[PDB]
Amino acid sequence: MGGSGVEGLSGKRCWLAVRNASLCQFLETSLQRSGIVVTTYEGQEPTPEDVLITDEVVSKKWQGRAVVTFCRRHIGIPLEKAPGEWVHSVAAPHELPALLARIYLIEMESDDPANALPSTDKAVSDNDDMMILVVDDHPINRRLLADQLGSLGYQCKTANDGVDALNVLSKNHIDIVLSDVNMPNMDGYRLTQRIRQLGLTLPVIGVTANALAEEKQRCLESGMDSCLSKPVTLDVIKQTLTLYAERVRKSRDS
């Protein structure tokens, strides 16, 4: 009924423009070990959710999630000094593929990257790290509200599953969980019950298509907090996110 369709991380794309077949094949196979689709980048468009892994000095900017520049001889592109750039002259040992899995936060393969050499002392300053998780039953809408979230400028995790939402709270710290439902392809009672039962600590926003049955069930479960319509607007999504950001600011303080 409805249509059993799951996405989540399985379907996340990674574009590769590596003429070095040795490096290209190595990286591409390692990423496809989970649910990542590596695609040959020739003249495609840059998505803010996608990463471009190229070989040698590139002449592009890639207005996306991140770009990885494996250096073979000559440089020209900066590095992590840019908003999503990573340079390293290597032949795909195991560190940068691991970095990709880290940036996506799949962590399905326990390789134990550690570090081959302390090349540079990296200062770890974290504080502005608000991670919002969006679980949508409809992939295209999932990317749509995720785009809105990315337009605000915060951590956006694109998911699709009922149990994996709760599982995500157990995996890492998401502050606000958005549950977007357009199609009743799956019973949602288990979702609210299990999420609060196993350890709900954060506010949940239930966004549903037509709050006819939603109001009744979500009140009975009382495992969300806020509720809105599937066709959410930029302003509405902005105010709700901002209010919640300041709300947790109250509880956690500085």
Curated annotation (Swiss-Prot):
Modification note: Autophosphorylated. Activation probably requires a transfer of a phosphate group from a His in the transmitter domain to an Asp in the receiver domain.
Record-listed 4-aspartylphosphate modification sites: D180
Cellular localisation: Cell inner membrane
Domain Response regulatory: 131-245
Domain ABL: 10-110
Family statement drawn from the similarity comment of this UniProt entry: Belongs to the RcsC family.
Assembly and oligomerization: Interacts with RcsD.
Function of the molecule: Component of the Rcs signaling system, which controls transcription of numerous genes. RcsC functions as a membrane-associated protein kinase that phosphorylates RcsD in response to environmental signals. The phosphoryl group is then transferred to the response regulator RcsB. Involved in regulation of K30 capsular polysaccharide synthesis.
Protein name as annotated: Sensor histidine kinase RcsC
Organism field: Escherichia coli
Full protein segment contained here: 700 to 949 of 949
